[PDB]
């Protein structure tokens, strides 16, 4: 018959530091065993302080992004100000939920800085539940990324070790290395990398090379 959803792969990783929030994703867009194109950035920009990733069916990633960017302007025109990171989460929770009967298949991870200037990451589900966390992942490689962060970021399973808040200098190498580890062992990840760092100054996009196979 007709199967409306297909899995296009993709991987999203967010880390909320004290002064910074990093949202990174790969470029590979692939349906089935074939690669359509090796540049398809998952990271999309909403406001200056907010970057949203979309991992899932690519047609919903394109539609949902145009719906969000449409309601950013509906808010900015009505309220004469940009949406806060917490407001984008609460809105997109109701946007994803209005599809409850015919859901969007996507994994949204919103990250950036809140009113306090601190890294705020909101990870969603296709049905629109959301909760704040220091680090989240998504997509096919989400299962590989999370255990690595529980150790380095969370200092779990280590007795009598000091807890130092993660530094951006360590965070850059931490995001790059988990993908170098994930792109190897995952077939849906590779061919390039795009890191969008959200600080108080602005968004800085950095591209990293990954295994091409």
């Amino acid at each position: 018959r007709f199967s409306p959803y297909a899995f296009n792969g993709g991987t999203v990783l967010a880390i909320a530091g004290e002064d910074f929030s990093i949202v990174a994703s790969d470029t590979r867009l692939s349906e089935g065993f074939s690669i359509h194109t090796r540049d398809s950035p998952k990271c999309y920009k909403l406001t200056d302080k907010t970057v949203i990733g979309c991992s899932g069916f690519h047609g919903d990633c394109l539609t949902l992004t145009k719906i969000i960017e449409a309601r950013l302007k509906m808010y900015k025109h009505s309220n004469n100000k940009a949406m806060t990171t917490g407001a984008i989460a609460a809105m997109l929770s109701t946007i994803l939920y209005s599809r409850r009967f015919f859901p969007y298949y996507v994994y949204n991870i919103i990250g950036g800085l809140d009113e306090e200037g601190k890294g705020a990451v909101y990870s969603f589900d296709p049905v629109g539940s959301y909760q704040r966390d220091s680090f989240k992942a998504g997509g096919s490689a989400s299962a590989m990324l999370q255990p690595l962060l529980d150790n380095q970021v969370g200092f779990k399973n280590m007795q009598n070790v000091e807890h130092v808040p993660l530094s951006l200098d360590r965070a850059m190498r931490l995001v790059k290395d988990v993908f170098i580890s994930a792109a190897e062992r995952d077939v849906y990840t590779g061919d390039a990398l795009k890191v969008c760092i959200v600080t108080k100054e602005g968004i800085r996009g950095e591209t990293v090379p990954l295994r091409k196979d």
Binding site: S93, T94, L96, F101, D125, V127, G128, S129, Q131, D133
Partner: protein, 201 residues
């Protein structure tokens, strides 16, 4: 997903764990299941995480509209009925939510259980979630209405601690919310694994 509540002399106590997983893979860990609604009203979370989280927000919206219109500070009994009536018009469409509504009204320490299909039950003791059965055992172990405050929390801890230990879809940290006449107050948030090796000596 394990959740429980019980009422006694000094009022209600609510206890949940933090874990919510999808399949064999644990999605998140510290997720807070208990939903705050009013100062003196407290909801819970069971079933689909997005469904009960959404519809409980409407109840938080309707309780506000009631208090603004009438100014009568809605009782726990009516707030339980609003959440059921909203879930009854979408019946058959696949909404899965459990829930419990706790609070202190003019009548007393009311506690209710509102379900996906409209089941509305007052009562002394309730538990929901996948590990609900494991909670009733420890709660029925000699809980009495005459327990003091400290003796009551020790039961709330020891119920979830043994509930998540037996259940693989339940775990994380125990969130305990005491209830009083004025409003709820958070007793503690404590890791299960750290309480296990306590009770294990």
């Amino acid at each position: 997903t394990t959740t429980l509540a019980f009422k006694f002399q000094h009022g209600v106590i609510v206890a949940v764990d933090s874990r919510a997983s999808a399949g064999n893979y644990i999605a998140t860990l510290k997720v807070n299941k208990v939903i705050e609604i009013n100062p003196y009203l407290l909801g819970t979370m069971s079933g689909c995480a997005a469904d009960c989280l959404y519809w409980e927000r409407l109840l938080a919206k309707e309780c506000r509209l009631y208090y603004l219109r009438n100014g009568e500070r809605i009782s726990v009994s009516a707030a339980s009925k609003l959440l059921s009536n909203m879930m009854c018009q979408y019946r058959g469409m696949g909404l899965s939510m459990g829930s419990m509504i706790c609070g202190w009204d003019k009548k007393g320490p009311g506690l209710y259980y509102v379900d996906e299909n409209g089941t509305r039950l007052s009562g002394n003791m309730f538990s929901t979630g996948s590990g609900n059965s494991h909670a009733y055992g420890v709660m029925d172990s000699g809980y009495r209405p005459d327990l003091s405050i400290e003796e009551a929390y020790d039961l709330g801890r020891r119920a979830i601690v043994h509930a998540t230990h037996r259940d693989s879809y339940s775990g994380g940290v125990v969130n305990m919310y005491h209830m009083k006449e004025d409003g709820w107050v958070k007793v503690e948030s404590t890791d299960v694994s750290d309480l296990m090796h306590q009770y294990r000596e």
